[PDB]
């Protein structure tokens with residue numbers, strides 16, 4: 001699944017931030033709590049979704065349909 | 067274009083017995099070709 | 111004149127300010143109007159010409175429905191509702207179109223910056239999906255590999271936040287009054303000390319400490335509120351505050367004219 | 373099949389008014405009003421400012437059931453002074469106060485935008 005659009009609690013758009021939050025952890029070697037802080041999500045209702053969302057979409061995507 | 071059968075995009079256009087085992091594939095399960103008809107949704 | 115206002119700080123996306131010489135119902139109703147009643151534009155109905163992807167169709171619909179849209183000029187057009195036309199004229203709606211292809215060997219993403227305006231835009235600044243980051247991509251929709259196709263026809267309409275959270279600009283709100291609890295509208299659960307066991311408000315220093323020993327100022331009354339508005343970005347924040355005050359007064363004037371006409 | 377959707381949540385009375393003007397029979401000069409397609413975001417404001425006015429004697433609103441977007445409001449006041457006049461005075465006060473607020477806000481917003 002993708003990241004959600006739009007945090008359920010608050011409403012701020014999330015989903016632009018996903019691959020950014022990834023490459024904050026790939027090459028920048030950064031601690032993730034500070035990564036979300038530097039990403040700029042200071043309330044925590046927004047913060048839970050990026051921190052807990054799992055990405056099943058690529059595990060789906062590694063089939064070969066049609 | 068009426069049937070799929072496989073990972074191949076073999077548009078069989080089947081009437082009867084035109085190698086349901088499609089030529090580029092091997093399959094014999096014959097999946098069935100999502101429509102061209104226009105569909106409606108509702109993004110409420 | 112009346113209800114004075116003081117700006118603490120401002121940005122592209124959030125307003126933080128002080129509101130005085132006002133009553134509690136006034137402030138709270140402003141809050142609720144501002145969270146529920148602002149008209150805007152959002153994508154509403156969608157026609158799948160062709161889907162192939164893993165991702166499911168009503169996901170594509172629902173996740174479409176949540177992309178914020180440019181709505182400066184929202185007042186220029188009118189509701190589909192009230193419109194003289196039928197079936198989405200240019201003077202009540204706008205049309206969106208998406209195209210995707212599994213081109214590369216790698217997975218290809220479909221960002222919001224790919225859907226394009228099609229119909230007559232008639233020179234009013236409407237509908238362009240907001241790009242908040244500095245890397246061009248909008249918000250992610252869907253991923254594809256090498257054979258999947260999307261062909262989407264989309265229609266946006268007016269809508270307001272009351273019947274769906276699509277049409278919200280609000281996205282968050284903050285609210286605070288009497289940070290020192292001088293009005294005694296609460297008392298603190300505790301086990302040793304209220305003062306030690308609770309963190310001080312950030313807005314404490316804006317008012318003096320309660321002077322420690324003076325009797326209970328019973329005749330006083332709540333004032334001097336503390337707001338922080340933070341829009342999603344479909345519309346600038348000054349616009350959302352001013353439009354909320356405008357639509358609240360429009361509501362009240364409507365009830366007044368209804369009464370006079372009765 | 374006949375369960376209502378959110379169209380009836382705020383769309384004003386279809387083949388219907390916006391409000392009823394029904395006289396109470398239990399106290400002198402009392403009238404109940406039934407607004408509909410509205411809720412607390414209105415009602416609390418009108419009740420509070422009308423109570424802030426001094427000539428009235430009673431003002432309270434309730435919503436019946438959160439399944440329905442209607443709510444009631446009861447006003448009584450001393451003699452001579454009409455409750456409908458009280459309500460229209462209250463609405464005038466509201467429009468004038470928050471128009472002032474709006475003005476004030478654009479002034480300070482333009483000021484805060486540097487230069």
Ligand SMILES: [Zn+2]
Pocket residue numbers: 007008009010011012043044045046047
């Ligand atoms: Zn949130």
Ligand SMILES: [Zn+2]
Pocket residue numbers: 070071072073074076088090091092093
């Ligand atoms: Zn095959």
Ligand SMILES: [Zn+2]
Pocket residue numbers: 190193194195196198199200201202203
């Ligand atoms: Zn129209």
